[PDB]
Protein backbone atom coordinates (compact mmCIF):
# COMPACT_ATOMS: atom_id res chain seq x y z
CA UNK A 1 0.00 0.00 0.00
CA UNK A 2 1.45 3.29 -1.22
CA UNK A 3 0.27 4.96 1.57
CA UNK A 4 2.65 3.24 4.49
CA UNK A 5 5.71 5.44 2.76
CA UNK A 6 4.06 8.42 4.48
CA UNK A 7 5.09 9.77 8.18
CA UNK A 8 2.36 7.90 10.78
CA UNK A 9 0.19 10.70 11.92
CA UNK A 10 -1.97 10.43 14.74
CA UNK A 11 -3.77 12.89 17.08
CA UNK A 12 -6.39 12.30 20.17
CA UNK A 13 -7.81 14.28 22.68
CA UNK A 14 -11.42 14.23 24.45
CA UNK A 15 -14.49 16.26 22.31
CA UNK A 16 -17.13 14.95 24.55
CA UNK A 17 -16.50 15.99 28.47
CA UNK A 18 -18.19 14.23 31.15
CA UNK A 19 -19.34 16.26 34.06
CA UNK A 20 -16.97 15.10 36.28
CA UNK A 21 -14.05 16.29 33.93
CA UNK A 22 -12.40 19.95 33.95
CA UNK A 23 -13.75 22.10 31.46
CA UNK A 24 -17.03 19.95 30.95
CA UNK A 25 -19.28 20.00 28.19
CA UNK A 26 -22.44 21.87 28.73
CA UNK A 27 -25.48 23.60 26.30
CA UNK A 28 -25.55 26.83 26.61
CA UNK A 29 -28.62 26.91 28.76
CA UNK A 30 -26.59 25.63 31.50
CA UNK A 31 -27.81 22.32 31.65
CA UNK A 32 -24.67 19.87 31.74
CA UNK A 33 -24.30 15.83 31.61
CA UNK A 34 -23.42 13.43 33.38
CA UNK A 35 -22.09 11.18 30.51
CA UNK A 36 -22.18 10.91 26.92
CA UNK A 37 -22.18 7.80 24.61
CA UNK A 38 -23.53 7.03 21.27
CA UNK A 39 -21.26 8.98 18.75
CA UNK A 40 -22.02 9.66 15.73
CA UNK A 41 -19.81 11.74 13.01
CA UNK A 42 -20.00 13.42 9.79
CA UNK A 43 -17.88 15.24 6.95
CA UNK A 44 -20.07 17.59 5.23
CA UNK A 45 -19.83 18.77 1.85
CA UNK A 46 -18.29 21.92 2.82
CA UNK A 47 -15.54 20.12 4.59
CA UNK A 48 -17.42 20.68 7.82
CA UNK A 49 -17.22 17.90 10.42
CA UNK A 50 -20.49 17.36 12.60
CA UNK A 51 -20.29 15.39 15.60
CA UNK A 52 -22.88 14.18 17.14
CA UNK A 53 -23.61 11.95 20.56
CA UNK A 54 -26.64 11.24 23.16
CA UNK A 55 -25.85 13.23 26.63
CA UNK A 56 -27.05 11.09 29.11
CA UNK A 57 -28.25 13.69 31.51
CA UNK A 58 -28.21 12.02 35.40
CA UNK A 59 -26.02 8.41 34.93
CA UNK A 60 -24.82 6.94 32.18
CA UNK A 61 -27.82 4.79 31.39
CA UNK A 62 -29.50 3.96 28.01
CA UNK A 63 -32.78 5.21 29.43
CA UNK A 64 -33.83 8.38 31.26
CA UNK A 65 -33.63 12.35 30.12
CA UNK A 66 -31.01 11.74 26.95
CA UNK A 67 -30.26 14.67 24.59
CA UNK A 68 -28.94 14.31 21.05
CA UNK A 69 -25.93 16.91 21.26
CA UNK A 70 -23.92 17.90 19.33
CA UNK A 71 -20.74 19.84 17.95
CA UNK A 72 -18.83 21.58 14.62
CA UNK A 73 -16.10 22.19 13.44
CA UNK A 74 -15.40 26.04 13.59
CA UNK A 75 -15.02 26.48 9.60
CA UNK A 76 -15.10 23.99 7.31
CA UNK A 77 -11.33 23.65 6.93
CA UNK A 78 -9.88 23.56 9.74
CA UNK A 79 -10.46 19.64 10.26
CA UNK A 80 -10.86 19.26 13.48
CA UNK A 81 -7.19 19.20 14.40
CA UNK A 82 -6.79 20.97 17.78
CA UNK A 83 -9.26 21.49 20.60
CA UNK A 84 -10.14 25.01 19.77
CA UNK A 85 -11.47 24.20 15.80
CA UNK A 86 -14.44 22.71 17.73
CA UNK A 87 -17.36 24.88 18.42
CA UNK A 88 -19.54 24.39 22.22
CA UNK A 89 -21.98 21.92 22.70
CA UNK A 90 -25.54 22.56 20.91
CA UNK A 91 -28.42 20.50 20.85
CA UNK A 92 -30.58 18.66 17.92
CA UNK A 93 -33.66 17.64 20.51
CA UNK A 94 -33.86 17.65 24.20
CA UNK A 95 -37.71 17.73 24.80
CA UNK A 96 -39.30 16.54 26.98
CA UNK A 97 -37.92 13.95 30.02
CA UNK A 98 -37.59 11.81 26.83
CA UNK A 99 -34.60 9.70 25.61
CA UNK A 100 -33.57 10.83 22.37
CA UNK A 101 -30.63 9.15 20.63
CA UNK A 102 -28.67 6.64 18.46
CA UNK A 103 -27.66 9.40 16.36
CA UNK A 104 -27.05 7.94 12.32
CA UNK A 105 -26.34 10.72 9.95
CA UNK A 106 -25.81 10.59 6.50
CA UNK A 107 -24.47 13.58 4.45
CA UNK A 108 -26.47 14.13 0.95
CA UNK A 109 -24.90 17.15 -1.11
CA UNK A 110 -26.27 20.55 1.16
CA UNK A 111 -28.76 18.35 3.14
CA UNK A 112 -27.59 16.37 6.23
CA UNK A 113 -30.27 13.61 7.63
CA UNK A 114 -30.50 12.71 10.85
CA UNK A 115 -31.88 9.81 11.81
CA UNK A 116 -32.36 9.14 15.51
CA UNK A 117 -34.27 6.64 17.72
CA UNK A 118 -36.88 7.48 20.77
CA UNK A 119 -38.64 6.52 23.86
CA UNK A 120 -40.91 8.07 26.31
CA UNK A 121 -39.03 8.99 29.21
CA UNK A 122 -41.43 6.67 31.54
CA UNK A 123 -39.90 3.02 29.41
CA UNK A 124 -36.98 1.64 29.27
CA UNK A 125 -35.70 -1.21 27.30
CA UNK A 126 -36.03 -3.90 30.25
CA UNK A 127 -38.56 -2.18 32.59
CA UNK A 128 -38.31 -1.85 36.39
CA UNK A 129 -35.41 0.78 35.90
CA UNK A 130 -35.25 3.79 38.61
CA UNK A 131 -35.45 7.12 37.29
CA UNK A 132 -34.05 10.23 39.41
CA UNK A 133 -37.68 10.85 40.69
CA UNK A 134 -38.21 7.84 42.45
CA UNK A 135 -40.17 5.68 40.00
CA UNK A 136 -39.48 2.39 37.74
CA UNK A 137 -39.73 2.53 33.92
CA UNK A 138 -42.41 0.22 32.24
CA UNK A 139 -41.37 -1.75 30.10
CA UNK A 140 -40.94 -0.97 26.01
CA UNK A 141 -43.68 -2.76 24.34
CA UNK A 142 -45.88 -2.36 21.24
CA UNK A 143 -47.71 0.22 22.27
CA UNK A 144 -47.70 3.94 20.64
CA UNK A 145 -46.90 5.47 23.91
CA UNK A 146 -44.48 2.39 24.53
CA UNK A 147 -42.26 1.53 21.45
CA UNK A 148 -39.64 2.59 20.78
CA UNK A 149 -39.91 5.27 17.74
CA UNK A 150 -37.83 6.76 14.67
CA UNK A 151 -37.10 10.13 14.13
CA UNK A 152 -36.19 12.39 11.30
CA UNK A 153 -34.35 15.79 11.28
CA UNK A 154 -32.38 17.73 8.89
CA UNK A 155 -30.50 20.53 8.47
CA UNK A 156 -29.95 22.23 5.20
CA UNK A 157 -27.15 24.67 6.75
CA UNK A 158 -24.40 22.63 7.24
CA UNK A 159 -25.18 21.37 10.39
CA UNK A 160 -26.06 24.81 12.30
CA UNK A 161 -29.36 24.27 12.86
CA UNK A 162 -31.61 21.43 12.52
CA UNK A 163 -35.70 21.10 11.69
CA UNK A 164 -37.85 20.06 14.39
CA UNK A 165 -37.58 16.57 14.11
CA UNK A 166 -40.41 14.08 12.65
CA UNK A 167 -41.45 10.51 13.68
CA UNK A 168 -41.10 8.30 10.71
CA UNK A 169 -42.46 5.41 13.09
CA UNK A 170 -45.52 4.31 11.09
CA UNK A 171 -43.96 4.32 7.53
CA UNK A 172 -40.15 3.50 8.78
CA UNK A 173 -40.93 1.07 11.71
CA UNK A 174 -42.75 -2.38 11.36
CA UNK A 175 -45.55 -2.50 12.53
CA UNK A 176 -45.89 -4.34 15.74
CA UNK A 177 -42.15 -4.00 17.11
CA UNK A 178 -41.63 -2.91 20.65
CA UNK A 179 -37.61 -2.17 21.20
CA UNK A 180 -35.71 -0.54 18.08
CA UNK A 181 -32.54 1.11 16.97
CA UNK A 182 -31.24 3.27 13.96
CA UNK A 183 -27.44 3.06 12.99
CA UNK A 184 -26.19 4.37 15.74
CA UNK A 185 -22.92 5.48 14.29
CA UNK A 186 -24.11 7.07 10.39
CA UNK A 187 -25.49 6.06 6.85
CA UNK A 188 -24.18 6.25 3.17
CA UNK A 189 -24.94 7.77 -0.08
CA UNK A 190 -24.34 5.26 -3.39
CA UNK A 191 -22.66 5.56 -5.78
CA UNK A 192 -26.24 4.79 -8.02
CA UNK A 193 -27.49 8.11 -5.81
CA UNK A 194 -29.45 6.34 -2.86
CA UNK A 195 -29.06 6.76 1.02
CA UNK A 196 -29.11 3.77 3.22
CA UNK A 197 -29.42 3.93 6.87
CA UNK A 198 -29.13 0.76 8.58
CA UNK A 199 -31.84 0.06 11.84
CA UNK A 200 -32.44 -3.06 13.48
CA UNK A 201 -33.61 -5.61 10.96
CA UNK A 202 -33.95 -3.69 8.17
CA UNK A 203 -32.02 -0.86 5.65
CA UNK A 204 -33.79 2.75 5.31
CA UNK A 205 -33.65 3.73 1.84
CA UNK A 206 -33.56 7.19 0.73
CA UNK A 207 -35.01 7.99 -2.57
CA UNK A 208 -35.53 11.17 -5.02
CA UNK A 209 -33.20 14.06 -5.71
CA UNK A 210 -30.66 15.37 -2.97
CA UNK A 211 -32.03 16.95 -0.29
CA UNK A 212 -35.41 15.93 -1.32
CA UNK A 213 -35.68 12.32 -0.52
CA UNK A 214 -38.67 9.49 0.71
CA UNK A 215 -37.74 7.02 2.25
CA UNK A 216 -38.47 2.97 2.47
CA UNK A 217 -38.03 -0.10 4.32
CA UNK A 218 -36.01 -2.73 2.82
CA UNK A 219 -36.37 -5.87 5.77
CA UNK A 220 -34.24 -7.49 6.04
CA UNK A 221 -33.73 -11.59 7.59
CA UNK A 222 -30.99 -12.34 10.38
CA UNK A 223 -29.84 -8.81 10.53
CA UNK A 224 -28.94 -7.76 13.88
CA UNK A 225 -30.36 -4.48 16.11
CA UNK A 226 -27.35 -2.37 15.52
CA UNK A 227 -25.78 -2.18 12.44
CA UNK A 228 -23.46 -0.88 10.04
CA UNK A 229 -23.75 -0.18 5.86
CA UNK A 230 -20.93 -0.04 3.32
CA UNK A 231 -21.32 -0.07 -0.11
CA UNK A 232 -18.05 -2.14 -0.94
CA UNK A 233 -15.69 -1.80 -3.99
CA UNK A 234 -17.20 -3.89 -6.14
CA UNK A 235 -20.53 -1.94 -5.51
CA UNK A 236 -22.56 -4.27 -3.36
CA UNK A 237 -24.22 -3.10 -0.28
CA UNK A 238 -22.62 -4.89 2.81
CA UNK A 239 -24.26 -5.11 6.30
CA UNK A 240 -21.77 -5.88 9.44
CA UNK A 241 -23.63 -5.88 12.77
CA UNK A 242 -23.27 -6.20 16.39
CA UNK A 243 -24.11 -10.05 16.91
CA UNK A 244 -26.28 -10.79 19.83
CA UNK A 245 -24.14 -13.40 21.87
CA UNK A 246 -20.66 -11.80 22.73
CA UNK A 247 -18.30 -13.26 20.35
CA UNK A 248 -18.12 -11.89 16.30
CA UNK A 249 -19.31 -9.66 13.77
CA UNK A 250 -22.55 -10.73 11.54
CA UNK A 251 -22.15 -9.84 8.21
CA UNK A 252 -24.32 -9.79 4.84
CA UNK A 253 -24.15 -8.85 1.30
CA UNK A 254 -26.30 -8.02 -1.74
CA UNK A 255 -27.72 -5.23 -3.12
CA UNK A 256 -30.57 -2.84 -2.96
CA UNK A 257 -33.13 -5.49 -4.46
CA UNK A 258 -31.87 -7.91 -1.30
CA UNK A 259 -29.38 -9.40 1.34
CA UNK A 260 -27.59 -12.92 1.39
CA UNK A 261 -27.73 -14.70 4.80
CA UNK A 262 -26.13 -12.87 7.72
CA UNK A 263 -22.91 -15.10 9.03
CA UNK A 264 -20.44 -14.88 11.46
CA UNK A 265 -17.27 -13.70 10.62
CA UNK A 266 -14.84 -15.37 12.58
CA UNK A 267 -11.89 -12.35 11.31
CA UNK A 268 -13.08 -9.93 13.49
CA UNK A 269 -13.96 -10.69 17.06
CA UNK A 270 -16.48 -8.60 18.93
CA UNK A 271 -17.93 -8.55 22.42
CA UNK A 272 -21.49 -7.90 21.63
CA UNK A 273 -20.84 -3.77 21.12
CA UNK A 274 -21.07 -1.83 18.25
CA UNK A 275 -18.82 -1.17 15.38
CA UNK A 276 -18.36 1.31 12.36
CA UNK A 277 -17.33 1.01 8.98
CA UNK A 278 -15.83 3.63 5.96
CA UNK A 279 -15.61 3.21 2.47
CA UNK A 280 -11.92 5.26 2.48
CA UNK A 281 -11.34 5.85 -1.06
CA UNK A 282 -12.11 4.53 -4.82
CA UNK A 283 -9.54 4.84 -6.26
CA UNK A 284 -6.08 2.47 -6.56
CA UNK A 285 -5.96 0.46 -4.08
CA UNK A 286 -9.67 0.77 -3.01
CA UNK A 287 -10.03 0.57 0.49
CA UNK A 288 -12.27 -0.23 3.56
CA UNK A 289 -11.79 0.55 7.55
CA UNK A 290 -13.57 -0.93 10.06
CA UNK A 291 -13.32 -0.17 13.65
CA UNK A 292 -14.79 -2.05 16.71
CA UNK A 293 -13.07 -3.65 20.00
CA UNK A 294 -11.09 -6.75 18.50
CA UNK A 295 -12.15 -9.24 21.84
CA UNK A 296 -14.57 -11.31 22.25
CA UNK A 297 -15.63 -10.64 25.87
CA UNK A 298 -14.32 -6.83 26.10
CA UNK A 299 -14.84 -3.40 24.89
CA UNK A 300 -11.46 -2.05 25.66
CA UNK A 301 -9.41 -3.63 23.00
CA UNK A 302 -10.14 -1.23 19.66
CA UNK A 303 -8.93 -1.91 16.92
CA UNK A 304 -8.84 -0.28 13.16
CA UNK A 305 -7.98 -2.14 10.04
CA UNK A 306 -8.17 -1.89 6.16
CA UNK A 307 -9.76 -4.28 3.75
CA UNK A 308 -8.57 -4.52 0.10
CA UNK A 309 -10.98 -6.92 -1.00
CA UNK A 310 -13.58 -5.89 -3.35
CA UNK A 311 -16.32 -7.47 -1.23
CA UNK A 312 -14.23 -6.55 2.30
CA UNK A 313 -14.03 -10.39 2.52
CA UNK A 314 -10.39 -9.94 4.65
CA UNK A 315 -9.14 -7.46 7.24
CA UNK A 316 -5.71 -6.83 8.26
CA UNK A 317 -4.65 -7.17 12.01
CA UNK A 318 -4.73 -3.31 11.23
CA UNK A 319 -3.43 -1.07 14.41
CA UNK A 320 -4.83 -1.10 18.52
CA UNK A 321 -5.43 2.24 19.32
CA UNK A 322 -4.14 1.60 22.64
CA UNK A 323 -0.49 2.26 20.76
CA UNK A 324 -1.73 6.23 20.85
CA UNK A 325 -3.38 6.10 24.21
CA UNK A 326 -5.05 9.08 25.60
CA UNK A 327 -4.48 9.90 29.25
CA UNK A 328 -7.03 11.79 31.60
CA UNK A 329 -9.75 9.96 29.79
CA UNK A 330 -10.89 7.05 32.10
CA UNK A 331 -10.70 3.87 29.85
CA UNK A 332 -10.96 4.13 26.28
CA UNK A 333 -13.13 1.35 24.44
CA UNK A 334 -17.10 0.80 22.99
CA UNK A 335 -18.91 2.52 20.33
CA UNK A 336 -17.18 4.38 17.51
CA UNK A 337 -17.79 6.21 14.39
CA UNK A 338 -15.35 7.45 11.86
CA UNK A 339 -15.53 9.84 8.76
CA UNK A 340 -13.05 10.97 6.55
CA UNK A 341 -11.50 14.43 6.75
CA UNK A 342 -10.46 16.67 3.96
CA UNK A 343 -6.83 16.61 4.96
CA UNK A 344 -7.06 12.75 4.24
CA UNK A 345 -7.12 11.43 7.82
CA UNK A 346 -9.62 9.38 9.13
CA UNK A 347 -11.47 11.15 12.14
CA UNK A 348 -12.89 8.79 14.85
CA UNK A 349 -15.23 9.42 17.81
CA UNK A 350 -14.77 6.48 20.23
CA UNK A 351 -16.47 6.02 23.92
CA UNK A 352 -14.35 5.94 27.33
CA UNK A 353 -15.48 5.11 30.24
CA UNK A 354 -14.01 6.40 33.68
CA UNK A 355 -15.22 3.28 35.39
CA UNK A 356 -15.95 4.77 38.81
CA UNK A 357 -18.74 3.32 40.08
CA UNK A 358 -17.53 -0.21 37.97
CA UNK A 359 -20.44 -1.08 35.73
CA UNK A 360 -22.93 0.58 37.50
CA UNK A 361 -25.04 3.83 36.73
CA UNK A 362 -22.81 6.27 37.94
CA UNK A 363 -19.45 5.85 36.02
CA UNK A 364 -18.95 8.34 33.90
CA UNK A 365 -18.68 8.23 30.32
CA UNK A 366 -16.76 10.74 27.90
CA UNK A 367 -15.91 10.37 24.13
CA UNK A 368 -12.82 10.92 22.86
CA UNK A 369 -11.87 12.05 18.61
CA UNK A 370 -8.90 10.97 17.14
CA UNK A 371 -7.37 11.62 13.79
CA UNK A 372 -4.75 9.26 11.90
CA UNK A 373 -3.58 8.89 8.52
CA UNK A 374 -3.58 5.52 6.95
CA UNK A 375 0.33 5.28 7.37
CA UNK A 376 -0.90 4.81 11.58
CA UNK A 377 -2.58 1.96 10.65
CA UNK A 378 -0.44 0.38 8.26
CA UNK A 379 2.32 0.28 9.92
CA UNK A 380 1.22 -0.66 13.44
CA UNK A 381 3.99 -3.40 14.63
CA UNK A 382 1.24 -6.36 14.49
CA UNK A 383 0.15 -5.45 11.49
O1 LIG B 1 -3.76 8.85 2.47
C1 LIG B 1 -4.48 9.16 1.51
O2 LIG B 1 -5.71 9.40 1.60
C2 LIG B 1 -3.80 9.37 0.14
O3 LIG B 1 -3.18 10.68 0.21
C3 LIG B 1 -2.77 8.31 -0.29
C4 LIG B 1 -3.47 6.99 -0.61
O4 LIG B 1 -2.53 6.03 -1.07
C5 LIG B 1 -4.50 7.20 -1.72
O5 LIG B 1 -5.23 6.00 -1.96
C6 LIG B 1 -5.42 8.26 -1.21
C7 LIG B 1 -6.54 8.62 -2.19
O6 LIG B 1 -6.00 9.01 -3.46
C8 LIG B 1 -7.33 9.81 -1.63
O7 LIG B 1 -7.72 9.60 -0.31
C9 LIG B 1 -8.57 10.09 -2.49
O8 LIG B 1 -9.54 9.05 -2.43
O9 LIG B 1 -4.73 9.51 -0.92
O1 LIG C 1 -23.91 -0.28 25.46
C1 LIG C 1 -24.82 -1.07 25.11
O2 LIG C 1 -24.67 -2.31 25.01
C2 LIG C 1 -26.23 -0.52 24.86
O3 LIG C 1 -26.94 -0.89 26.05
C3 LIG C 1 -26.25 1.00 24.64
C4 LIG C 1 -27.40 1.46 23.76
O4 LIG C 1 -27.87 2.72 24.25
C5 LIG C 1 -28.53 0.44 23.72
O5 LIG C 1 -29.58 0.89 22.85
C6 LIG C 1 -27.99 -0.88 23.17
C7 LIG C 1 -29.00 -2.02 23.34
O6 LIG C 1 -29.22 -2.25 24.73
C8 LIG C 1 -28.49 -3.33 22.71
O7 LIG C 1 -28.27 -3.16 21.32
C9 LIG C 1 -29.48 -4.47 22.94
O8 LIG C 1 -30.76 -4.14 22.39
O9 LIG C 1 -26.74 -1.26 23.79
O1 LIG D 1 -14.89 -4.23 28.54
C1 LIG D 1 -15.99 -4.06 29.04
O2 LIG D 1 -17.06 -4.32 28.45
C2 LIG D 1 -16.00 -3.44 30.45
O3 LIG D 1 -15.65 -4.43 31.43
C3 LIG D 1 -15.01 -2.28 30.62
C4 LIG D 1 -15.49 -1.10 29.85
O4 LIG D 1 -14.62 -0.07 30.12
C5 LIG D 1 -16.89 -0.70 30.31
O5 LIG D 1 -17.39 0.45 29.50
C6 LIG D 1 -17.78 -1.91 30.11
C7 LIG D 1 -19.23 -1.78 30.61
O6 LIG D 1 -19.29 -1.48 32.02
C8 LIG D 1 -19.88 -3.18 30.40
O7 LIG D 1 -19.59 -3.75 29.09
C9 LIG D 1 -21.39 -3.12 30.59
O8 LIG D 1 -21.93 -4.43 30.37
O9 LIG D 1 -17.29 -3.03 30.81
Not at 44 to 55: K, P, S, W
Not at 114 to 137: E, I, R
Not at 140 to 154: A, F, K, M, N, P
Not at 227 to 246: A, E, F, V
Amino acid sequence: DPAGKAAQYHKEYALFRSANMPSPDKLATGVGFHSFRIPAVVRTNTGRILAFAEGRRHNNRDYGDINLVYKRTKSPTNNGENPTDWESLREVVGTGPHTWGNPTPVVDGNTIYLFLSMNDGAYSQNGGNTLPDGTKTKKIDSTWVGRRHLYLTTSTDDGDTWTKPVDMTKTLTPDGQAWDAVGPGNGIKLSTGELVIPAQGRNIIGRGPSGNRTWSMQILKGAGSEGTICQTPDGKLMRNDRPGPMGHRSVARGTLAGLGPFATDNGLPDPACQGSILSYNSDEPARTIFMNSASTDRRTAMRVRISYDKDAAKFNFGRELKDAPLGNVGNEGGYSSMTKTSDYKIGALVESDWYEDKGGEKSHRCIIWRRFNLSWIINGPNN
